Amino acid sequence: ENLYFQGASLTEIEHLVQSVCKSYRETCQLRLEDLLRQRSNIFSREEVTGYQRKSMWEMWERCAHHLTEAIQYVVEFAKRLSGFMELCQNDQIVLLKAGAMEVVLVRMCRAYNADNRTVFFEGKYGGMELFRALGCSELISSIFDFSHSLSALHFSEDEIALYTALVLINAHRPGLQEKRKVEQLQYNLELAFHHHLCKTHRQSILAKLPPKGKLRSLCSQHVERLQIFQHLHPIVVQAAFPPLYKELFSGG
């Protein structure tokens, strides 16, 4: 069915490296240069107050919609990924349901500026105070601290590409039917990723990378804060939340 479901040679590993870096470039949502070309367009104190003055439900809707758009590009990355489409539909959904948010959280460090501790949100850079109306301060400081940690690693687009393929292709996801098939694909991508770090003299970041429990904690915290908002505003979720968001985080 697919080459990456068996043992691959050094040459095949080299083509996987370029395949992943290619698939990523076609689905990154915003170019790194465009994101760096805005670091100076910061939201004003008046605009920050404007966000802070927005209702909790409005802030949640805006954020859920932005999360949904970013997740949609991650779905495209997955489809263009070598071996993902050769997996069954159950496994494709399992991997995307568990991995999509984790990929968005990793991709996010590009859109975060460690110098001023701001994130590119709705056209400009704003600090974590911009999201004060959401009513989940622990989650926002946890997402900023994580992006601050990944920012310290000085990732290249290629490194983000290779690592995000790994975050998604996880053979340990509960509910996987073809566990051995996902095990071989994960192995080949681990080889692909480690090959590039070796070739680029970047193997030192391997020990500096966050644990798999960190990405899980952030995803679980998101589902927790969503359950709390849903209890407060059930109609806002039902009527104004994107169906993809509800499918991934509310199971319908």
Partner: peptide
């Protein structure tokens, strides 16, 4: 209940 993932995966 929603199922948009099945559509996104099929749509090519």
């Amino acid at each position: 209940k929603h199922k948009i993932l099945h559509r996104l995966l099929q749509d090519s």
